[PDB]
Amino acid sequence: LLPMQRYLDNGRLATRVARATLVAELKRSFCDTSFFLGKAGHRREAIEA
Amino acid sequence: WLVDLTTATQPSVAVPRLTHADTRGRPVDGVLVTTAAIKQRLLQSFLKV
């Protein structure tokens, strides 16, 4: 939803490229921070963020 | 770097009727419209209120 709302904090883009730049970055933000606490649990100020 | 965004541009004109000021404080002079994600970074760990 963090890549999803920033796509919808654009207007929304039916150009189908920004559909695709959504998805290939939608899959990237998930692979990075799904399990964020415990993966970044000791990092203070990232859990604050 | 924020002290280069602040104090790069020359001030235009002393307009009298526009007086945005602090609460019992000095008149305001800058704007700094940012995005919502950068607001949660500068105000988090670089600036005061």
UniProtKB/Swiss-Prot annotation, chain B:
Disulfide bonds: none annotated. Self-assembles to form an icosahedral capsid with a T=16 symmetry, about 200 nm in diameter, and consisting of 150 hexons and 12 pentons (total of 162 capsomers). Hexons form the edges and faces of the capsid and are each composed of six MCP molecules. In contrast, one penton is found at each of the 12 vertices. Eleven of the pentons are MCP pentamers, while the last vertex is occupied by the portal complex. The gene is MCP. Belongs to the herpesviridae major capsid protein family. It comes from the Viruses. It is found in: Virion; Host nucleus. Homomultimer. Makes the hexons and eleven out of twelve pentons. Interacts with triplex proteins 1/TRX1 and 2/TRX2; adjacent capsomers are linked together in groups of three by triplexes, heterotrimeric complexes composed of one molecule of TRX1 and two molecules of TRX2. Interacts with scaffold protein; this interaction allows efficient MCP transport to the host nucleus. Interacts with capsid vertex component 2/CVC2. Interacts with the small capsomere-interacting protein/SCP. This is Major capsid protein.
